[PDB]
């Protein structure tokens, strides 16, 4: 409708089509940043007149992939430790407080951590 293709939204109101070349990403229709130029507007340029849009680089949207990861629930501890699950090949190790009654993501990886006592509240 060209409104979902040119406006930043938290979620796509429809199912992304992997074969649609007007989407921002193969797995996401709408852009994920307010300053991110829409792909449909970008491809409407004189330099795409005789160019095949299918072979252009279209990496998957990282925002949709990170939220497919289940929340890590910590038992008998209010602090979560994350370093990228790689150690020396990850990110600097940081400590996440889990006192609040919600899942709190990592500052680097985006993995979300929470206490098991809040599992019922978060899922609903």
């Amino acid at each position: 409708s060209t409104k979902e293709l040119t406006t930043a939204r938290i979620k796509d109101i429809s199912k992304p089509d992997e074969n649609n070349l007007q989407q921002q990403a193969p797995n996401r229709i709408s852009p994920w940043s307010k300053s991110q130029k829409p792909r449909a507007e970008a491809q409407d340029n004189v330099r795409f007149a005789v160019k095949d849009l299918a072979k252009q680089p279209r990496p998957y949207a990282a925002i949709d992939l990170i939220y497919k990861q289940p929340i890590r629930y910590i038992e008998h501890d209010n602090v979560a430790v994350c370093d990228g699950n790689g150690g020396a090949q990850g990110h600097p190790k940081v400590y996440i407080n889990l006192d609040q009654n919600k899942a709190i993501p990592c500052g680097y990886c985006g993995l979300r951590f929470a206490q098991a006592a809040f599992k019922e509240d978060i899922e609903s």
């Binding site: 940081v94 996440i96 609040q100």
Partner: protein
């Protein structure tokens, strides 16, 4: 009272009771510090400033230890080097490894002082881990990452003493002590955002500015603020074509390192609702046009209505530069017109203060003399919302002395104690004749402050008559060295417009039914007459009610995109400095009038900015003396005050209502700012909502 001490073999001399860290700065010796700020109360909770007194077996904190005569101070012995490394290690023990994701990265005092004075290696390998602290929500302006706090209490000291907001403090004990408001609420203060600058670490950061830039990328321009009539000096940071953030810069005479939340967070409105192309109205729609076509249409529309002498009306808004005001005045004058005024709603066609005498409409005492005030009278003003920085200065003097502040008018939430008297001229007459007027007469340096909203009420003439009679009849208010009469404006263009006489003193002129109206940034025109058949031209940088009422729109540049002259409420001439270029095909505001003048047969003799600025000297000789206040002589000042004394004028007994309704919506830039939209939803129009209804 001076004491001759020694700092690393350097003779120093300062006032008795000065801290060692103050004497070290005067001697050129640099001592690291985290918890010490030269504008806050003394704390010794960070221990980074430790020095060695010559004959004493204990290390003294230089920010709190008073100076003595004959004291010899060492600041670079190996013992002190051990202390600096030890304190640095303790600070970084629990600090999170957040520099890449932390907005303080390139401008962090913890980073720079740890590099300069701490060790190059850490020894914290504990498997238990660091302390983790949850993030507090205190509104949409201040972003909190409390893991990074070093418990320095700069925010607590500032918000309680300077800002006057006691909802922020330290809760807990020991390693579990957490800065915040304990309960889930926001910080309600027009100066709350200054806490971001004071926080040396990334614990408190700007939320609109989060993640968008690094300090080494930005270009720094020293310009002035135009969101109020104080003219607070600011440092605008730009990254190419876009303004990223606004920061205050030191000026002890005007703003003193502080700015209001409106000043530093309205910069995001420069990217919204901007006027970039000339617009020509065709029925009920605006269409784009070239500059030649737009200027020709105005000339064609000028000859369609055939306006006469006073049928040409010029209106100047709050954000209008002084070069454009004189250019518009001269173009208006060349067309044989005198109907010029501002977009205000003053009842009397000539404002009660007038324009003949500068002393009648300026802060004659100057802002820096509030430090010496003993008695202050507020007449129908709300300094907390009109001059946020100047309001905090009064609190600082109030805290450190027996200064008494009396208020006449509408009561408001204040940061100090107000001795309220009434809400009309009748109370002011009682006060100036009663005990309140006796205090001013006996005061050594009294202050009288009239609000800009007094001239917008029906009792404008009575208020200026009551004060002028009291001022002229008392010999202590006006002296060769002191002048206790002050007017506090809320718009940055008023004093500049009055200095050039851009106002009509003839009631007959102002009642003319105009046929050609030139809106120069004027937007408060709901109560100002605009004939339906009149030809309206709007010149500005934002699309607002002024643009919608126009027939041809001429895009101008903002204050950050032009070297412009602004005169503040105390009669201080300040010049802006261009940081970026105007967007689209927008031009400088004084060049649009000059270019249009040639299309109207009234070609102005101005070609460049220097010639335009030379015209300012002809209109008024003090307009080319930047950063200098030219005072009114004692003899001339008395005549101007005496001219305000008008016998045989009645007092209607109406409320001296405060002029500002919404603190975050005072001009086009603030209204267009998305951040101010969040402030209204969260903080409220009067900054009274303690709970955030837009934060989940």
């Amino acid at each position: 009272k001076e004491v001759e001490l020694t700092v690393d073999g350097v003779k120093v001399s300062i006032e008795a009771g000065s801290s060692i860290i103050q004497a070290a700065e005067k001697a050129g010796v640099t001592i690291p510090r985290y918890c010490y700020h030269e504008k806050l109360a003394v704390a010794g909770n960070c221990r980074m400033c430790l020095v060695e007194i010559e004959r004493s077996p204990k290390l003294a904190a230089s920010c709190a230890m008073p100076v003595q005569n004959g004291m010899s101070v060492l600041t670079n012995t190996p013992k002190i080097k051990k202390a600096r490394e030890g304190v640095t290690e303790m600070l970084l023990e629990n600090h999170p490894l957040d520099c890449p994701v932390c907005d303080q990265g390139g401008e962090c005092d913890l980073q720079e002082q740890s590099l300069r004075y701490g060790s190059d290696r850490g020894r914290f390998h504990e498997i238990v881990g660091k302390r983790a602290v949850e993030n507090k929500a205190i509104g949409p302006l201040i972003k909190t990452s409390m893991n990074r706090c070093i418990h320095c209490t700069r925010c607590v000291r500032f918000l309680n003493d300077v800002a006057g907001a006691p909802e922020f403090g330290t809760a807990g004990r020991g390693n579990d002590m957490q800065i915040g408001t304990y309960v889930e609420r926001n910080v309600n203060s027009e100066l709350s955002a200054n806490v971001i600058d004071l926080c040396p670490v990334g614990a408190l950061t700007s939320k609109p500015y989060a993640f968008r830039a690094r300090p080494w990328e930005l270009k720094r321009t020293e310009t002035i603020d135009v969101h109020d009539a104080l003219g607070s000096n600011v440092r605008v940071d730009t990254r190419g074509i876009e303004v990223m953030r606004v920061l205050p810069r030191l000026n002890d005479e005007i703003n003193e390192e502080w700015i209001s939340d409106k000043t530093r967070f309205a910069c995001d409105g420069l990217k919204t609702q901007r006027l970039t192309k000339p617009l020509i109205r065709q029925g009920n729609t605006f269409v784009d046009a070239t500059w030649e076509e737009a200027l020709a249409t105005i000339a064609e529309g000028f000859q369609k209505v055939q306006p006469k002498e006073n049928e040409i009306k010029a209106i100047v808004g709050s954000l209008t530069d002084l070069e454009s005001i004189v250019a518009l005045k001269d173009l208006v004058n060349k067309l044989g017109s005198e109907n010029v005024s501002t977009d205000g709603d003053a009842t009397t066609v000539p404002p009660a203060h007038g324009a003949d005498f500068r002393s009648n409409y300026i802060f004659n005492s100057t802002i820096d003399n509030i430090e010496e005030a003993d008695q202050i009278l507020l007449v129908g003003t709300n300094p907390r919302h009109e001059a946020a920085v100047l309001n905090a200065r009064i609190r600082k003097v109030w805290l450190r002395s027996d200064l008494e502040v009396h208020h006449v008018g509408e009561e408001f939430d204040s940061t100090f104690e107000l001795n309220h008297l009434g809400s009309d001229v009748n109370a002011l007459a009682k006060a100036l004749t009663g005990e309140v007027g006796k205090k001013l007469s006996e005061a050594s340096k009294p202050l009288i402050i009239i609000g800009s909203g007094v001239t917008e009420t029906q009792d404008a003439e009575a208020v200026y008559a009551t004060v002028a009679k009291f001022v002229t009849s008392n010999a202590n208010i006006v002296t060769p060295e002191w002048n206790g009469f002050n007017l506090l404006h809320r718009e940055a263009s008023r004093v500049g417009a009055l200095d050039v006489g851009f106002t009509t003193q003839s009631p007959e002129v102002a009642n003319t039914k105009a046929k050609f109206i030139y809106l120069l940034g004027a937007d408060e025109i709901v109560n100002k007459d605009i004939p339906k058949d009149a030809f309206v031209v709007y010149q500005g940088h934002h699309g607002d009610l002024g643009a919608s009422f126009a027939d041809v729109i001429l895009p101008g540049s903002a204050y950050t995109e032009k070297t412009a002259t602004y005169v503040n409420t105390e009669g201080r001439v300040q010049s802006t400095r261009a940081a970026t270029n105007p967007p689209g095909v927008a031009r400088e505001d004084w060049m649009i009038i000059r270019a249009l003048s040639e299309y109207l047969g009234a070609t102005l003799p101005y070609d460049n900015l220097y010639e335009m600025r030379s015209r300012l000297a002809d209109v008024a000789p003090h307009l080319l003396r930047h950063e200098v206040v030219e005072p009114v002589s004692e003899g001339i000042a008395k005549v101007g005050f005496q001219s305000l004394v008008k016998p045989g004028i009645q007092s209607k007994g109406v409320l001296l209502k405060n002029p500002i309704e919404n603190f975050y919506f005072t001009d086009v830039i603030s209204k267009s700012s998305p951040t101010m939209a969040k402030c209204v939803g969260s903080f409220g129009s009067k900054i009274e909502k303690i709970k955030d209804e837009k934060a989940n």
